[PDB]
UniProtKB/Swiss-Prot annotation:
The modification Phosphothreonine is found at T13, T40. It comes from the Eukaryota. It is linked to Glioma: Gliomas are benign or malignant central nervous system neoplasms derived from glial cells. They comprise astrocytomas and glioblastoma multiforme that are derived from astrocytes, oligodendrogliomas derived from oligodendrocytes and ependymomas derived from ependymocytes. The modification Phosphoserine is found at S19. The gene is H3-3A. GO terms for molecular function: nucleosomal DNA binding; protein heterodimerization activity; RNA polymerase II cis-regulatory region sequence-specific DNA binding; RNA polymerase II core promoter sequence-specific DNA binding; structural constituent of chromatin. Belongs to the histone H3 family. This is Histone H3.3.
Amino acid sequence: QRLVREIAQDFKTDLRFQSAAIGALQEASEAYLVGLFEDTNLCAIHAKRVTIMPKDIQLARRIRGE
DNA sequence: ATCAGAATCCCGGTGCCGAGGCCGCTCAATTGGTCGTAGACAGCTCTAGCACCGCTTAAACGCACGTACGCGCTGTCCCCCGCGTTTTAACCGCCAAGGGGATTACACCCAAGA
């Protein structure tokens, strides 16, 4: 919640947030991170490796189009 | 280091079908006027958001030691890297299947209708 407020402050000052909105943001961020970690593990296994590396995340984000 | 070699870019050169300029309307855009409801503004409110304290505790960071996943280097033989030959994806002229004019010689005579 603190990170969300600090990020939203850079876009518009004096902003309020509801509990449902914060929960939805947290759920969406967790799902996106889980998907990114799945893609990272897939890329690491494809490279004959077990431990994940930032190169795996970069390749996943480049293939996904982010 | 150094050269011979096939592969690549720019220049005379050219013309032609695509890019570019012009004419007549006419159907969409503009003007003017009459309804009129969804939009802008003021007011009451209380719920929802915000800041702070009391007490609690499992989560997060520093420590100890080695190891196994991480990564450089080696032996192999492999299946693509690349050239030479037509061929398979279609593109391009003469056979032996029939539809038709032509004939039954030459000259003469008789009979009977429009």
